[PDB]
Swiss-Prot record:
Result of altering H370A: Inhibits histone 3'-end processing
Residue range from the parent sequence: 7 to 459 of 684
GO biological process terms, semicolon-separated: co-transcriptional mRNA 3'-end processing, cleavage and polyadenylation pathway; mRNA 3'-end processing; mRNA 3'-end processing by stem-loop binding and cleavage; positive regulation of G1/S transition of mitotic cell cycle
Keywords, in A-Z order: Acetylation, Disease variant, Endonuclease, Epilepsy, Hydrolase, Intellectual disability, Isopeptide bond, Metal-binding, mRNA processing, Nuclease, Nucleus, Phosphoprotein, Ribonucleoprotein, RNA-binding, Ubl conjugation, Zinc
Ubl conjugation recorded as keyword: yes
Recorded consequence of changing H67A: Inhibits histone 3'-end processing
Task of the protein: Component of the cleavage and polyadenylation specificity factor (CPSF) complex that plays a key role in pre-mRNA 3'-end formation, recognizing the AAUAAA signal sequence and interacting with poly(A) polymerase and other factors to bring about cleavage and poly(A) addition. Has endonuclease activity, and functions as an mRNA 3'-end-processing endonuclease. Also involved in the histone 3'-end pre-mRNA processing.
Disease listed for this protein: Neurodevelopmental disorder with microcephaly, hypotonia, nystagmus, and seizures: An autosomal recessive disorder characterized by global developmental delay and impaired intellectual development apparent from infancy. Affected individuals have hypotonia, poor or absent motor skills, feeding difficulties with poor overall growth, microcephaly, mild dysmorphic features, and early-onset seizures. Additional variable features include nystagmus, cortical blindness, and spasticity.
Result for mutant: D69A: Inhibits histone 3'-end processing
Essential cofactor(s): Zn(2+)
Gene name for this UniProt entry: CPSF3
Protein name: Cleavage and polyadenylation specificity factor subunit 3
Effect seen on changing H70A: Inhibits histone 3'-end processing
Length: 433
């Protein structure tokens, strides 16, 4: 009566948000889940601790979605490394992939990015694929277009990895599915910890009212967002709000990003995963040089964290006027300017090194689309995994989620469950007969 030991260990996103990269080890098989970069770090430190292993022993690599913290390091791993296994991702994911990293570059060069394309295989949702002795398939994760939750089976043992997911339907995205096939192990995100913020209807109303308030008092409203993802949802909301308020029809809304033309084009190519994306009050803006910053307006510009680029340029030219305002709609990662601002600093530092007073208003209305405790608990209750591994949340939020889940099952339902809280590099060991 033998027993096989399964090993799970994060090289990134272990007790943190950023650079997701988790290694699975079972019966001679080695799997890597995601391969992104930490938005709050730079250089080689923004990468996961891949040095703890050698890329030549990794049979399979699965990427959940196109966000940089999940695939930002892929080109590097596929070119400048000794990796020779197979890599898979959703069709939409790969599509939106080539157009996201490029905008990010302007680690790896646009050449390294192209040399990657051919090393990445695609997979449809609900379709079994097999590599080495590994069977895998994916379910819709909600969150962003093409996002997936990968189920993996090896020797009868099943593990579901959620990547980032949302159980609440968007204005254009479907809610994550709850698989009927029960996993032995669940690796799940913990971004929001146990925090349960306003409902969608409330968040949208507050978002519109804040934007309205800013332009009404004569200010410019800045909304940092990466080219594709949540930005598309915000645009639908704004265009619709403007349509219902003609007094705003003379106030321009701009969608600014490099190649924003293909961003919408390629994005609509996958309507499968009236055309609302035919905006009547929004226009594309290529860069600061094509912008006549004349009067009040609203500008949605990347990068989402204002670490640099246009959103940062705009913020720097607008932060000293009380009439202006910025709305942060995404999860703020440590080390990020967007995160810092929300501290109410008296002044900020220009990329040049200048010091400017922060007078423009700063509002945080989250549209990052991650599950919350209620969704996560319901998710876990339906799947009933004996083992749960948390992997994409700040230390304290993750700790709170873990204690809440343990309390819910051990104390309340008086049922046995095991929740793991691995730090980067820390391994989790499980034995299957
Ligand atoms: Zn994400
Ligand atoms: Zn993420
Ligand atoms: Zn009105
Ligand atoms: Zn127990």
């Amino acid at each position: 009566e033998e027993s096989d030991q399964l090993l799970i260990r994060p090289l990134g996103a272990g007790q943190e948000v950023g650079r997701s990269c988790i290694i699975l080890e079972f019966k001679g098989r080695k799997i890597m889940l995601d391969c992104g970069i930490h938005p709050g770090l730079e250089g080689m430190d923004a990468l996961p601790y891949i040095d703890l292993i050698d890329p030549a022993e990794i049979d399979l690599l699965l990427i959940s979605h196109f966000h940089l913290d999940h695939c930002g390091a892929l080109p590097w791993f596929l070119q400048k490394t000794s990796f020779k296994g197979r890599t898979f991702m959703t069709h939409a994911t790969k599509a939106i992939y080539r157009w996201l990293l490029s905008d990010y570059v302007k680690l790896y060069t646009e050449t390294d990015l192209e040399e990657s394309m051919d090393k990445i295989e695609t997979i449809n949702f609900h379709e079994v694929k097999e590599v080495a002795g590994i069977k895998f398939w994916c379910y819709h994760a909600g969150h962003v277009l093409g996002a997936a939750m990968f189920m993996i089976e090896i020797a009868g043992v099943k593990l579901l990895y959620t990547g980032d997911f949302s159980r609440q339907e968007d204005r254009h995205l479907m809610a994550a599915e709850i698989p009927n096939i029960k996993p032995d192990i669940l690796i799940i995100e913990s971004t929001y910890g146990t925090h349960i913020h306003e409902k969608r209807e409330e968040r949208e109303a507050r978002f519109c009212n804040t934007v309205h308030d800013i332009v009404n008092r004569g200010g410019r409203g800045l909304i940092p967002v990466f080219a594709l993802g949540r930005a598309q949802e915000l645009l639908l909301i704004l265009d619709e709000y403007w349509q219902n308020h003609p007094e705003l029809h003379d106030i321009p809304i701009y969608y600014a990003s490099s190649l924003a033309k293909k961003c919408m084009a390629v994005y609509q190519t996958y309507v499968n995963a009236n055309n609302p994306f035919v905006f009547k009050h929004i226009s594309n803006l290529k860069s600061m040089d094509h912008f006549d910053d004349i009067g009040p307006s609203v500008v949605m510009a990347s990068p989402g964290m204002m670490q640099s680029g246009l959103s940062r340029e705009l913020f720097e030219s607008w932060c000293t006027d009380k009439r202006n305002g910025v709305i942060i709609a995404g999860y703020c990662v440590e080390g990020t300017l967007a995160k810092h601002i929300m501290s109410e600093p008296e002044e900020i530092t220009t990329m040049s090194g200048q010091k400017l007073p922060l007078k423009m208003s700063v509002d945080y209305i989250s549209f990052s689309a991650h599950t919350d405790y209620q969704q996560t608990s319901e998710f876990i209750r339906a799947l009933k995994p004996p083992h749960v591994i948390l992997v994409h949340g700040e230390q304290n939020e993750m700790a709170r989620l873990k204690a809440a889940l343990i309390r819910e099952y051990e104390d309340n339902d008086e049922v046995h469950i095991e929740v793991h809280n691995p730090r980067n590099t820390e391994a989790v060991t499980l034995n299957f007969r």
